[PDB]
Amino acid sequence: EQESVKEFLAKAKEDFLKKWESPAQNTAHLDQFERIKTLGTGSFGRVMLVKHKETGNHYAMKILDKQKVVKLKQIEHTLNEKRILQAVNFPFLVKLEFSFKDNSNLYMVMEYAPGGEMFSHLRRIGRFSEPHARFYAAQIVLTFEYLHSLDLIYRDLKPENLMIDQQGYIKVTDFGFAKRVKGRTWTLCGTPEYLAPEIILSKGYNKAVDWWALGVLIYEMAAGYPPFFADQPIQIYEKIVSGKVRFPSHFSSDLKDLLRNLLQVDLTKRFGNLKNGVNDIKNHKWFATTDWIAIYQRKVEAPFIPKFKGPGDTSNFDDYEEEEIRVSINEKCGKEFSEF
């Protein structure tokens, strides 16, 4: 099944570079969608549930205010997230259906994940059973095998960015911190609790930081809380760099072993960063029962299937105040976002 994987990534790389070098642009217009309800807001602007007026298909539309993006100094970040979304294709990566812009905003119309934010589900149940956590972890492992083969580093893995779809599978969202790089980079970015030691420290780092983040995720999913936490980020960094980790007593021995190899301060030993690469992870005992191809094919029964009343149902998301989408009579930051 190894020959197929190598063959799979080969074609995947071919399809990726064609789109990466020739990105799609202006594939739709705002008036084609009816705004329904806001699913989330904040710095990233806002994500609304919308409905294509003719097909009746529902989507999650991320709206960014150009002037705001400039103020936040996120110009390159936003252009890059879109360039990446339109070029990638993987079962667990959220799909970009359409993208366009007008005088005031930038829009990314993506596939809607009805199930809700993983964050919500975790804080709701407390913690996921090891089998439940494993089902999700497997999807991430494959997603990172895919992304890393394209020299793409994610850099913002966390329950907050993982959506749950109708079949209970994952949809990774937000690539505003992702980057295409072979070798090392130095940017301090990400979410405090999930930063690898080498990101906090001034020295450069590589894709190995995604594998450390995977360790933090598995740990939070199975414990109900992260391995390193405190009131303030600087205190959290202190704990991370020390690397002292304690595990709940209910953690199986093999789970602790896997975590010891992922939350490994020494790169020469961190799983995912050795000679056998991702295979050290896929062949670890904790994953003994995992049917990798079946996961990729979405054939495995999800241990948790979120409720779903309809394709336009938003009962699995929080409530937000609605705000009129205003479009300035004048074009703003045309030069800055010409590539979008």
């Binding site: 904040g42 710095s43 936040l72 934010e117 964050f119 804080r123 913002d156 966390k158 907050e160 505003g176 911190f177 301090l188 970015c189 990400g190 979410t191 405090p192 609790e193 109900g224 809380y225 992260p226 936490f229 405190a230 009131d231 980020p233 304690r246 709940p248």
Partner: peptide, 19 residues
């Protein structure tokens, strides 16, 4: 316990990325 500490940490809600 660790759980109790987390519950009182002020960081149980959605966590933003660093800016």
């Amino acid at each position: 316990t660790t759980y109790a500490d987390f519950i009182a940490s002020g960081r149980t809600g959605r966590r933003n990325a660093i800016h």
